[PDB]
């Protein structure tokens, strides 16, 4: 009845607000229905906005993601006579790099790794993906756990503009923002490791 597709890459998140969108082009383009499940092909995730883990539009939202949430989730995509079930491994880690090095990011998945081209005007991104109901407040950026304060760096909402990339620009970057969902405020901090090409 439904074609099983296995996602080869694991998605990692800190124990804080997290959202993953069921965007799998070309299958999710056009008139299709999307249903999120939590390690089941029969019982879906809750649709109650007040649930800690719930389906918000095409997204699975964790407010917040916490220890015990790691596992396999399923996005069932149904079109006009067509069914696909994506098995997605979402994994939570407990701590942030600037607080402690223990129990943090277990591996450098693609999302936590970015590159800056030496001598070029380049940019970094947050990897802060949330549905429209999660309004992101002012975004602050850090380099090696200290707020960025340099002529070549410019915060531009969810992007960090970097002028004339130098070799000293290698290091860990992070972006922090206040997330506002249903009148409640939560904090989100996302890190990245940047290497200079």
């Amino acid at each position, epitope marked *: 009845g439904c074609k099983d597709i296995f996602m080869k890459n694991e998605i990692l998140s800190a124990s804080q607000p997290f959202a993953f969108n069921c965007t799998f082009p070309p299958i999710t383009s056009g008139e299709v229905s999307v249903t999120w499940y939590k390690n089941s092909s029969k019982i879906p995730v809750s649709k109650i906005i007040q649930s800690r883990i719930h389906q918000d539009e095409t997204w699975i939202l964790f407010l917040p993601m916490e220890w015990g949430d790691s596992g396999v989730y399923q996005c069932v995509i149904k079109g006009r006579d067509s069914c696909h079930r994506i098995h997605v491994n979402l994994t939570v880690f407990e701590k942030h*790099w600037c607080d402690t090095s223990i129990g943090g990011l277990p*591996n450098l998945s693609d999302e936590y790794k970015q590159i800056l081209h030496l001598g070029k005007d380049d940019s970094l991104t947050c990897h802060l993906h949330f549905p429209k109901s999660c309004v992101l407040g002012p975004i602050k950026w850090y380099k090696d756990c200290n707020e960025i304060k340099g002529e070549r760096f410019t915060v531009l909402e969810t992007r960090l503009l970097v002028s004339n990339v130098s070799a000293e620009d290698r290091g860990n970057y992070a972006c922090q923002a206040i997330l506002t969902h249903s009148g409640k405020q939560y904090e989100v901090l996302n890190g990245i490791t940047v290497s200079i090409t």
Partner: antibody, heavy 119, light 109 residues
């Protein structure tokens, strides 16, 4: 290549303090946690704590709270471990090690520093 | 504190034999946070096996790591004289960081 160079061996009388150095190279010093590990003669390894040179934040093992104090001088890429109120139980080879983001293990270590506590 | 109970404490084997050492954690450790180190006298510990089963730089294929949750194992399939060392397991999951008491490997001849 990533390298950690520690200060030389020291003898201190009981009650004194000692400061051990760990000068790093081969990577951006401010981007990684420096950890300190104790090895008393003939014994195993005991984790003492960690310091982030970027924000100077420290986390000590509860067993070493107020015995160990960790510090950094980012201008010379050096991490410092200070031990106070020295006793023969503090006699050990102390190692510094470094952890990188997304790589939660100790791939590089210093040569060690023997601190002997004696009258 | 996650306690790591390493066994045996000492192991005496001839070259070519299989060396097996186990490490038991009091609480579950994720595969990415469990490691083994090799230490020779008068030298610092060397990363030997990282993330439960990956071999660190310069580590021969005769070494392998396995395990999950609370039970982990380090195996040397065909002992060489160079393997005489102390091996320590290690967890990077919860504070404070802990190590097993060690397994000293002696080589018979």
């Amino acid at each position: 290549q990533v390298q950690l160079v520690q200060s030389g061996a020291e003898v201190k009388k009981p009650g004194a303090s000692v400061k051990v150095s760990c000068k790093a190279s081969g990577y951006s010093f401010t981007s990684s946690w420096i950890h300190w590990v104790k090895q008393a003669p003939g014994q195993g390894l005991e984790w003492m704590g960690e310091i982030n040179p970027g924000n100077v934040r420290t986390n000590y093992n509860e067993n070493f709270r107020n015995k160990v104090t960790m510090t950094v001088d980012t201008s010379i890429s050096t991490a410092y471990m200070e031990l106070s109120r020295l006793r023969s139980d503090d006699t050990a080879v102390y190692y510094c090690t470094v952890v990188f983001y997304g790589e939660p293990y100790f791939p590089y270590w210093g040569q060690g520093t023997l601190v002997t506590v004696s009258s | 504190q996650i306690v790591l109970t390493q066994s045996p404490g000492t192991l005496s084997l001839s070259p070519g034999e299989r060396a097996t050492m186990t490490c038991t954690a009091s609480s579950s450790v994720s595969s990415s946070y469990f490691h083994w180190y090799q230490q020779k006298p008068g030298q610092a510990p060397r990363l030997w096996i990282y993330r439960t089963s990956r071999l660190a730089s310069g580590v021969p294929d005769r070494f392998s790591g396995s395990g999950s949750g609370t039970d982990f194992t380090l195996t040397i399939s065909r002992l060489e004289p160079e393997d005489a060392a102390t091996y320590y397991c290690h967890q990077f999951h919860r504070s404070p960081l802990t190590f097993g008491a060690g397994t000293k490997l002696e080589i018979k001849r």
